[PDB]
Design a protein around this motif. Structure first.
Motif, PDB file in Angstrom:
ATOM      1  N   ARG A   1      41.828  49.937  39.695  1.00  0.00           N
ATOM      2  CA  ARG A   1      42.473  50.635  40.651  1.00  0.00           C
ATOM      3  C   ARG A   1      43.778  49.896  41.208  1.00  0.00           C
ATOM      4  O   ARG A   1      44.745  50.468  41.798  1.00  0.00           O
ATOM      5  N   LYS A   2      43.809  48.629  41.302  1.00  0.00           N
ATOM      6  CA  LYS A   2      44.814  47.657  41.811  1.00  0.00           C
ATOM      7  C   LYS A   2      44.761  46.475  40.940  1.00  0.00           C
ATOM      8  O   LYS A   2      43.558  45.886  40.585  1.00  0.00           O
ATOM      9  N   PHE A   3      46.144  46.086  40.714  1.00  0.00           N
ATOM     10  CA  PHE A   3      46.021  44.639  39.850  1.00  0.00           C
ATOM     11  C   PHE A   3      47.237  43.847  40.017  1.00  0.00           C
ATOM     12  O   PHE A   3      48.367  44.240  40.555  1.00  0.00           O
ATOM     13  N   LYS A   4      47.523  42.377  39.668  1.00  0.00           N
ATOM     14  CA  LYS A   4      48.601  41.682  39.826  1.00  0.00           C
ATOM     15  C   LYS A   4      48.881  41.226  38.352  1.00  0.00           C
ATOM     16  O   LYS A   4      47.971  41.285  37.401  1.00  0.00           O
ATOM     17  N   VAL A   5      50.263  40.923  38.033  1.00  0.00           N
ATOM     18  CA  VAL A   5      50.703  40.334  36.951  1.00  0.00           C
ATOM     19  C   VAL A   5      51.337  38.939  36.843  1.00  0.00           C
ATOM     20  O   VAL A   5      52.125  38.744  38.011  1.00  0.00           O
ATOM     21  N   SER A   6      50.895  38.251  36.016  1.00  0.00           N
ATOM     22  CA  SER A   6      51.459  36.846  35.983  1.00  0.00           C
ATOM     23  C   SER A   6      52.135  36.621  34.628  1.00  0.00           C
ATOM     24  O   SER A   6      51.519  36.998  33.452  1.00  0.00           O
ATOM     25  N   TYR A   7      52.951  35.932  34.470  1.00  0.00           N
ATOM     26  CA  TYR A   7      53.618  35.649  33.366  1.00  0.00           C
ATOM     27  C   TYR A   7      54.227  34.109  32.895  1.00  0.00           C
ATOM     28  O   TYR A   7      54.465  33.406  33.980  1.00  0.00           O
ATOM     29  N   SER A   8      54.457  33.663  31.812  1.00  0.00           N
ATOM     30  CA  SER A   8      54.903  32.430  31.449  1.00  0.00           C
ATOM     31  C   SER A   8      55.417  32.493  29.836  1.00  0.00           C
ATOM     32  O   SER A   8      55.446  33.348  29.150  1.00  0.00           O
ATOM     33  N   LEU A   9      56.341  31.425  29.611  1.00  0.00           N
ATOM     34  CA  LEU A   9      56.930  31.000  28.532  1.00  0.00           C
ATOM     35  C   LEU A   9      56.321  29.939  27.916  1.00  0.00           C
ATOM     36  O   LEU A   9      55.894  29.987  26.649  1.00  0.00           O
ATOM     37  N   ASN A  10      55.655  29.030  28.601  1.00  0.00           N
ATOM     38  CA  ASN A  10      55.152  27.884  28.327  1.00  0.00           C
ATOM     39  C   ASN A  10      53.491  28.057  27.705  1.00  0.00           C
ATOM     40  O   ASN A  10      53.108  27.641  26.848  1.00  0.00           O
ATOM     41  N   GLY A  11      52.962  29.044  28.773  1.00  0.00           N
ATOM     42  CA  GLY A  11      51.408  29.207  28.317  1.00  0.00           C
ATOM     43  C   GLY A  11      50.716  28.081  29.570  1.00  0.00           C
ATOM     44  O   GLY A  11      49.528  28.600  29.706  1.00  0.00           O
ATOM     45  N   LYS A  12      51.399  27.333  30.106  1.00  0.00           N
ATOM     46  CA  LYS A  12      50.993  26.354  31.041  1.00  0.00           C
ATOM     47  C   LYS A  12      51.438  26.376  32.569  1.00  0.00           C
ATOM     48  O   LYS A  12      50.765  26.301  33.646  1.00  0.00           O
ATOM     49  N   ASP A  13      52.800  27.103  32.624  1.00  0.00           N
ATOM     50  CA  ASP A  13      53.166  27.129  33.999  1.00  0.00           C
ATOM     51  C   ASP A  13      53.392  28.688  34.146  1.00  0.00           C
ATOM     52  O   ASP A  13      53.956  29.146  33.369  1.00  0.00           O
ATOM     53  N   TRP A  14      52.597  29.309  35.198  1.00  0.00           N
ATOM     54  CA  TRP A  14      52.561  30.663  35.224  1.00  0.00           C
ATOM     55  C   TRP A  14      53.378  31.070  36.364  1.00  0.00           C
ATOM     56  O   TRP A  14      53.534  30.264  37.595  1.00  0.00           O
ATOM     57  N   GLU A  15      53.859  32.425  36.544  1.00  0.00           N
ATOM     58  CA  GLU A  15      54.503  32.907  37.860  1.00  0.00           C
ATOM     59  C   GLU A  15      53.788  34.116  38.050  1.00  0.00           C
ATOM     60  O   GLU A  15      53.384  34.653  37.161  1.00  0.00           O
ATOM     61  N   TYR A  16      53.721  34.592  39.271  1.00  0.00           N
ATOM     62  CA  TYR A  16      53.257  36.140  39.738  1.00  0.00           C
ATOM     63  C   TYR A  16      54.525  36.925  39.970  1.00  0.00           C
ATOM     64  O   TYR A  16      55.476  36.540  40.605  1.00  0.00           O
ATOM     65  N   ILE A  17      54.528  38.087  39.418  1.00  0.00           N
ATOM     66  CA  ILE A  17      55.508  39.173  39.817  1.00  0.00           C
ATOM     67  C   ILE A  17      55.414  39.274  41.336  1.00  0.00           C
ATOM     68  O   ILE A  17      54.263  39.263  41.901  1.00  0.00           O
ATOM     69  N   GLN A  18      56.571  39.068  42.257  1.00  0.00           N
ATOM     70  CA  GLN A  18      56.295  38.970  43.592  1.00  0.00           C
ATOM     71  C   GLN A  18      56.993  40.143  44.273  1.00  0.00           C
ATOM     72  O   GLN A  18      58.152  40.497  44.069  1.00  0.00           O
ATOM     73  N   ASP A  19      56.157  40.896  45.265  1.00  0.00           N
ATOM     74  CA  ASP A  19      56.873  41.510  46.303  1.00  0.00           C
ATOM     75  C   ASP A  19      57.597  41.128  47.216  1.00  0.00           C
ATOM     76  O   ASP A  19      56.871  40.385  47.940  1.00  0.00           O
ATOM     77  N   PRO A  20      58.970  41.154  47.393  1.00  0.00           N
ATOM     78  CA  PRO A  20      59.664  40.507  48.576  1.00  0.00           C
ATOM     79  C   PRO A  20      58.940  40.660  49.923  1.00  0.00           C
ATOM     80  O   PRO A  20      58.711  39.532  50.639  1.00  0.00           O
ATOM     81  N   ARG A  21      58.435  41.899  50.120  1.00  0.00           N
ATOM     82  CA  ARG A  21      58.030  42.122  51.588  1.00  0.00           C
ATOM     83  C   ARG A  21      56.519  41.601  51.761  1.00  0.00           C
ATOM     84  O   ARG A  21      56.294  40.957  52.954  1.00  0.00           O
ATOM     85  N   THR A  22      55.772  41.236  50.609  1.00  0.00           N
ATOM     86  CA  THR A  22      54.650  40.488  50.765  1.00  0.00           C
ATOM     87  C   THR A  22      54.605  38.950  51.011  1.00  0.00           C
ATOM     88  O   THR A  22      53.892  38.542  51.581  1.00  0.00           O
ATOM     89  N   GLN A  23      55.816  38.559  50.423  1.00  0.00           N
ATOM     90  CA  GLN A  23      55.921  36.900  50.131  1.00  0.00           C
ATOM     91  C   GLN A  23      54.964  36.647  49.353  1.00  0.00           C
ATOM     92  O   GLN A  23      54.688  35.303  48.961  1.00  0.00           O
ATOM     93  N   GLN A  24      54.082  37.299  48.666  1.00  0.00           N
ATOM     94  CA  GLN A  24      52.991  36.983  47.803  1.00  0.00           C
ATOM     95  C   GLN A  24      53.081  37.836  46.485  1.00  0.00           C
ATOM     96  O   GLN A  24      53.824  38.898  46.561  1.00  0.00           O
ATOM     97  N   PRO A  25      52.477  37.646  45.302  1.00  0.00           N
ATOM     98  CA  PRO A  25      52.220  38.261  44.278  1.00  0.00           C
ATOM     99  C   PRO A  25      52.224  40.030  44.799  1.00  0.00           C
ATOM    100  O   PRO A  25      51.312  40.256  45.505  1.00  0.00           O
TER     101      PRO A  25
END
Lengths: 426, 219, 215
Positions: free
Chosen positions: A354-378
Motif C-alpha cells: 500500500r506504501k513503499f520507498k525506493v533506493s538506488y545505486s551504481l556501486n551496489g554498496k553505496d545506496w540513496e533513497y528517492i527523497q521528498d524535499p518536504r519530508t527531508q526523508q525518503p
C-alpha cells in the motif's frame, strides 16, 4: 532449430517451408529491437491443425516460459498482426511425430516508434480501426440467431452490435489487448437491429480489468464499484474518461442496466507506458532481467525462485520469510542506466503493498533513497489498491544499476509483491 | 401471464378518427413493444405499426403513414392507435400484439382480443330480441332446439351468450346477415333435452356494446 | 420489403391426416425469423412456431415446421377437427414485417344429416308488425344444402336469407339458419308455413311445418 532476428525487415517460417515440417521439433524464434523501435509481426500462411496438445506455435511477450504468453495457435487460422514495444517478441514452434503439416510463413518489421501528438494517452486502441483483431474480442455469450457477435462490437460498426445469449448483468464483452497497456477512456454505443429496426443500448456498465485474464478487478470509484453511465439512444456515442488511468491487458464491459436488450459497440482509449520518454520496461516482465539479477532481503520458504517477483508473468509474487515484518526491514532488489520509475503489483486472502520507498545505486554498496524535499526523508510512494492491477510510479530520472523497493504499508494478508523497473540507456 | 385487453367495438363516420386501447398487464415490465395489425373482413393480416413504449419511437407501415398515430402511456400500461381520415375499407378488426422481452426475432407471442371498427355513415340502433321456441313444444324427439332472434341492430357486433355463459355446449350463434338497407339480423340456438324444457328456464344474454344495450330474454 | 406467399389457400383434409402448408419469400429470410400463427374463426391469432418454423410454443406435437431462405413449411402430422383454422406465416428478417395470405384448413368428414327445426314468429315481434319464420338445419357435413320455403303449399322464394356457421371444432359440421321475413299482413293471409330441406344426408327431403292458428 532456433534463430535470432535483428535486421530491419525479415522472414520467419517453419523449417523447410514451403515443405511440410519435420517431426519432434522444438525451436525458438526471437526478434530483438532497439529502444524506440516497435516489432510488427505478420503471418502469411499457417497450417498446424490435426487444446493444442499435438502441434502448436507459442507467441511470447519476452523470453519463452518467462515472459507472459500472448497466444498458442494450432489451426488453419493465420494469427493476427502484433505490434510489440517490449523490445523482444519470441515464437516457440513445437511439432509431434504424426502428420507433418504445411507449417507457417511470417514476416517482421522493426519500425521507429512515433510518440502520439504530445504525450497524450487518448489514442483509440483499435476497436474501430481493426488494430485489435477479431481474435482479441470475445464475450461471455452471444445471441442465438448469431446476428450480434462479439466481433460486431466495434465502434461505428454498420451491422448491429454485440448482444449476449441472455440479458443479465453476468454477461460481458471482453477485449484482450495482448500486452500491458495504459487505459484512460471507454466509448460505447447501442445498436439498431438490421432486421427489426429495434434500438438496443446499455444504459450503465461496470469495468473489470486483468493482467493475465484470470484474476479480475472491478474498477471501483472510492470504496464502492464504479457504475459508468452509458448511452440513452442506440446511435450516439458516449465517452467516459477514467478519473485515474489504468494499467491492464484484459478489459471486460459488464452491462448493469439496458434499454430493451444488451447491445454494445465499443472503443477503448489509452497508450503504452513506453510512449512516455525513458519509460522502457527493463526486463522483469519479459525475462531480459534474468533470475541471477533478482534478490530479496528475506524469502518465505528455503530455496525460493527469483522468477516469482516478475511483474505480470509471475503467477504468485514475492513473499518475505516473515508474513508480518517491520517496515524498512524487507526489500526486493533488481540488478539491471537511467531509472524513471517502477511498476508495482500485488501477489496472486490476498496480499499487496500500500506504501513503499525506493533506493538506488551504481556501486551496489553505496545506496540513496528517492527523497521528498518536504519530508527531508525518503519519499513515501503510494502502492496498489488490489492484488492484480499494477500501478506505475514514475520519479525524477536517476542513474543506477541497482534498485530496491522497501515495503512500508501493506494489506492485512501481509507483503506480497511483483515488480518491473522503468527507464532507458544512457 | 401477459394479457392485452383492447377497447370495445365502435362505429365512426367516414373521415373521422378512431383511437383504440391496448391495456398491457400480467407480466408487464418496462421496454414493452406494441404492434398494431389490421384484419379486413375479407381476410389478411396487415401490420399498421409498432411503438417502443419507453422511448416514443413509433415505426409505421407506408400504407397507413400520414393516417396512423401510436401513443403509449407509461403511467397506465396502455397503448393507443389513432386512425385519421377513415375510409370504407378501414372497417376491420384491429389487433394489438407484443413480442417477448429478449426476442430480437419479434414473433408476436401475445395478442389482444380484437377491436371492430365499422366506418359507416348510417349510425347506431340497438337490437330487438325475440324468443324462438317451437309451437307444439311437447313433441317426441330426445332433444329440442331453442332460439333467440336479434333483429334490426347496427353496427356489428352483438354478443349472445346463454344462461349467463353457463351453456356453452350445443350453442350456435349464426353470422349476422345485413337486412333492409343497414340493419343486421342474427339468431342464436341452444340444443337442450326435451325432458328438461319444462323443468329448466333457458335465457339468452344479448350484449350490443356499440349502444350499451345489454338485454336478457327467457326463451 | 420482403413479400411472403402461402401457396395452398384452401385444404380439405380428413381427420388424422398429414397436411403440409407452404410459405415462400420474395427474398431470403434468416431461419430464426420466420414465425407461424393459427387464427380460429372468431378469435385473434395465436403463435404456433417462432423460429424457422422449428420452435413450437406450449402447443400440440403434430405441428412441425422447417425451411431455409425462401421456402418454409408447416406440417400437421395428424390433422384434427380442432385444427380447423387459417394459418399465417410472418417474417421479421427485414422491417416492415410481412404476413402471408393464409391457408384455410377445412376437414373432410363422413356425411351427416341436418336436425331440421322450424320456429314461429314471437308474439312480441307480431306487435312490431313484422313476422320472421326461422328454420335451423343443425349438424350436417357437406356444406351444400337446399332450403325450400313453402307457404300454404306454394313455394315462396322472395325474402329468404341464410346464415351458415363455420365448421365446428369438435364435430366438423356446419349449421344453417333460414329466416323468412314477412309483414304481419302476409303472415295473417296464410296458415301453413313449411321448410323443405334437401341434403345428401337423405333421399327424402325433410319437410317440417307449422300452422299459424295452432298454438
Amino acid at each position: 532449430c532456433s534463430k535470432n532476428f535483428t535486421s530491419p525487415n525479415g522472414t520467419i517460417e517453419s523449417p523447410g517451408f514451403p515443405e511440410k515440417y519435420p517431426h519432434n521439433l522444438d525451436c525458438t524464434f526471437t526478434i530483438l529491437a532497439k529502444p524506440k523501435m516497435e516489432i510488427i509481426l505478420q503471418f502469411l500462411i499457417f497450417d498446424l491443425e490435426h487444446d493444442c496438445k499435438y502441434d502448436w506455435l507459442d507467441i511470447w511477450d519476452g523470453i519463452p516460459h518467462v515472459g507472459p504468453l500472448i497466444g498458442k495457435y494450432c489451426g488453419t487460422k493465420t494469427p493476427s498482426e502484433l505490434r510489440s514495444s517490449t523490445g523482444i517478441l519470441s515464437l516457440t514452434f513445437h511439432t509431434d511425430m504424426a502428420v507433418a503439416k504445411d507449417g507457417f510463413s511470417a514476416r517482421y518489421y522493426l519500425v521507429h516508434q512515433e510518440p502520439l501528438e504530445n504525450f497524450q494517452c487518448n489514442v483509440p486502441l483499435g476497436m474501430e480501426s481493426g488494430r485489435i483483431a477479431n481474435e482479441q474480442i470475445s464475450a461471455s455469450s452471444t445471441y442465438s440467431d448469431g446476428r450480434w457477435t462479439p466481433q460486431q462490437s466495434r465502434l461505428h460498426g454498420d451491422d448491429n452490435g454485440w448482444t449476449p445469449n441472455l440479458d443479465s448483468n453476468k454477461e460481458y464483452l471482453q477485449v484482450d489487448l495482448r500486452f500491458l497497456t495504459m487505459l484512460t477512456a471507454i466509448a460505447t454505443q447501442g445498436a439498431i437491429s438490421r432486421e427489426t429496426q429495434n434500438g438496443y443500448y446499455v444504459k450503465s456498465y461496470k469495468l473489470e480489468v486483468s493482467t493475465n485474464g484470470e484474476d479480475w478487478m472491478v474498477y471501483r470509484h472510492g470504496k464502492n464499484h464504479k457504475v459508468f453511465q452509458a448511452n440513452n439512444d442506440a446511435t450516439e456515442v458516449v465517452l467516459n474518461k477514467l478519473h485515474a488511468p489504468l494499467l491492464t491487458r484484459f478489459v471486460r464491459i459488464r452491462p448493469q442496466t439496458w434499454h430493451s436488450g444488451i447491445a454494445l459497440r465499443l472503443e477503448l482509449f489509452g497508450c503504452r507506458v513506453t510512449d512516455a520518454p525513458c519509460s522502457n520496461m527493463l526486463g522483469m516482465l519479459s525475462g531480459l532481467i534474468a533470475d541471477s539479477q533478482i534478490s530479496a532481503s528475506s524469502t518465505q520458504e528455503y530455496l525460493w525462485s527469483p522468477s516469482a517477483a516478475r511483474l505480470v508473468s509471475s503467477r504468485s509474487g514475492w513473499f518475505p520469510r516473515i508474513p508480518q515484518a517491520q517496515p524498512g526491514e524487507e526489500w526486493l532488489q533488481v540488478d539491471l542506466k537511467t531509472v524513471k520509475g517502477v511498476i508495482i503489483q500485488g501477489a496472486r486472502a490476498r496480499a499487496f503493498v500500500r506504501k513503499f520507498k525506493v533506493s538506488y545505486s551504481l556501486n551496489g554498496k553505496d545506496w540513496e533513497y528517492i527523497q521528498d524535499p518536504r519530508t527531508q526523508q525518503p519519499k513515501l510512494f503510494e502502492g496498489n489498491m488490489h492484488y492484480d492491477t499494477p500501478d506505475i510510479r514514475r520519479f525524477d530520472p536517476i542513474p543506477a544499476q541497482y534498485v530496491r523497493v522497501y515495503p512500508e504499508r501493506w494489506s492485512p494478508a501481509g507483503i506480497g509483491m511483483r515488480l518491473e523497473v522503468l527507464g532507458c540507456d544512457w | 401471464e401477459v394479457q392485452l385487453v383492447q377497447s370495445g367495438a365502435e362505429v365512426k363516420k367516414p373521415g373521422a378518427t378512431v383511437k383504440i386501447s391496448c391495456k398491457v398487464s400480467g407480466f408487464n415490465i418496462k421496454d414493452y413493444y406494441i404492434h398494431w395489425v389490421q384484419q379486413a373482413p375479407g381476410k389478411g393480416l396487415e401490420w399498421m405499426g409498432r411503438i417502443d413504449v419507453e422511448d416514443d419511437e413509433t415505426k409505421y407501415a407506408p400504407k397507413f403513414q400520414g393516417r396512423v398515430t401510436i401513443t403509449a402511456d407509461t403511467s397506465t400500461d396502455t397503448a393507443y392507435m389513432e386512425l385519421s381520415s377513415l375510409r370504407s375499407e378501414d372497417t376491420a378488426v384491429y389487433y394489438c400484439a407484443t413480442p417477448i422481452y429478449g426476442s430480437r426475432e419479434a414473433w408476436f407471442a401475445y395478442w389482444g382480443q380484437g377491436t371492430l371498427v365499422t366506418v359507416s355513415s348510417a349510425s347506431t340502433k340497438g337490437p330487438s330480441v325475440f324468443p324462438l321456441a317451437p309451437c307444439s313444444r311437447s313433441t317426441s324427439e330426445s332433444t329440442a332446439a331453442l332460439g333467440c332472434l336479434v333483429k334490426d341492430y347496427f353496427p356489428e357486433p352483438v354478443t349472445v351468450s346463454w344462461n349467463s355463459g353457463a351453456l356453452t355446449s350445443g350453442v350456435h350463434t349464426f353470422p349476422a346477415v345485413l337486412q333492409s338497407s343497414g340493419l343486421y339480423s342474427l339468431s342464436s340456438v341452444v340444443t337442450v333435452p326435451s325432458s328438461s324444457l319444462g323443468t329448466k328456464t333457458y335465457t339468452c344474454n344479448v350484449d350490443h356494446k356499440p349502444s350499451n344495450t345489454k338485454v336478457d330474454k327467457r326463451v | 420489403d420482403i413479400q411472403m406467399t402461402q401457396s395452398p389457400s384452401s385444404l380439405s383434409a380428413s381427420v388424422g391426416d398429414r397436411v403440409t402448408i407452404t410459405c415462400t419469400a420474395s427474398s431470403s429470410v434468416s431461419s430464426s425469423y420466420l414465425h407461424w400463427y393459427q387464427q380460429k374463426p372468431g378469435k385473434a391469432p395465436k403463435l404456433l412456431i417462432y423460429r424457422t418454423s422449428n420452435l413450437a410454443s406450449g402447443v400440440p406435437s403434430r405441428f412441425s415446421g422447417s425451411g431455409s431462405g425462401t421456402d418454409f413449411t408447416l406440417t400437421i402430422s395428424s390433422l384434427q377437427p380442432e385444427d380447423f383454422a387459417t394459418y399465417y406465416c410472418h417474417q421479421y428478417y427485414r422491417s416492415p414485417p410481412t404476413f402471408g395470405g393464409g391457408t384455410k384448413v377445412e376437414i373432410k368428414r363422413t356425411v351427416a344429416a341436418p336436425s331440421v327445426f322450424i320456429f314461429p314468429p314471437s308474439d312480441e315481434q307480431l306487435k312490431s308488425g313484422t313476422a320472421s319464420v326461422v328454420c335451423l338445419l343443425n349438424n350436417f357435413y357437406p356444406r351444400e344444402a337446399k332450403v325450400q320455403w313453402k307457404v300454404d303449399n306454394a313455394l315462396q322464394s322472395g325474402n329468404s336469407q341464410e346464415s351458415v356457421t363455420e365448421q365446428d371444432s369438435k364435430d366438423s359440421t356446419y349449421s344453417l339458419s333460414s329466416t323468412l321475413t314477412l309483414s304481419k299482413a302476409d303472415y295473417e293471409k296464410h296458415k301453413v308455413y313449411a321448410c323443405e330441406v334437401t341434403h345428401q344426408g337423405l333421399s327424402s327431403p325433410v319437410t317440417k311445418s307449422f300452422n299459424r292458428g295452432e298454438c
